Amino acid sequence: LHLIPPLNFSMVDNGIFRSGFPDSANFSFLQTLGLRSIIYLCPEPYPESNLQFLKSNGIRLFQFGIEGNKEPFVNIPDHKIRMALKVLLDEKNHPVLIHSKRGKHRTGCLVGCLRKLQKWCLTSIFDEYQRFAAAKARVSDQRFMEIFDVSSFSHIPMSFSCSI
């Protein structure tokens, strides 16, 4: 039994995955996903180990650096989540792994905003967010999803989804 998914790994939808920061012990597992893209939500430069894996495997890196603040000093930039959603909604980029450091907060917000576009009720979105964030669930992350304006996205169709 040799495959090690990255921290807090899960399948979000057809072609869409979420996790925390992969390390070299996770690379054999990530190869099984046939990734085209990574959406990386931290500002820090990608380590050389991770860069060599991306290059070797023909994976494109999309970096939308969101500062990692703890409650009650969380202030998620709307523009970075919007730019990341535009990448996520283009099926040419699939399969895509979304990751941050822990796969709980920045990752959880992007996934929750996707669920809002998929017409999930807020309590269902928050329950999924909480399943990953567990004892580190942030009310501010859920408030961000509560007020995120989906108006600019209404036209973008999601025929990729398992949910039509």
Numbering used by the authors: 51 to 214
Show passages lifted from the paper:
Although the WPD loop is missing its canonical tripeptide motif, this structural element contributes to catalysis by assisting PP-InsP delivery into the catalytic pocket, for a choreographed exchange with phosphate reaction product. Additionally, we conclude that the hydrolyzed phosphate remains trapped as an enzyme-product complex, until it can be released in a prisoner exchange with another PP-InsP molecule; the latter process is assisted by the WPD loop.
We denote this orientation of Pi as pose A, i.e., Pi(A). The three other oxygen atoms of this Pi are intensively coordinated by amide groups of P-loop residues Lys151, Arg152 Lys154, His155, and Arg156. The side chains of Arg156 and Cys150/Ser150 also make polar contacts with Pi(A).
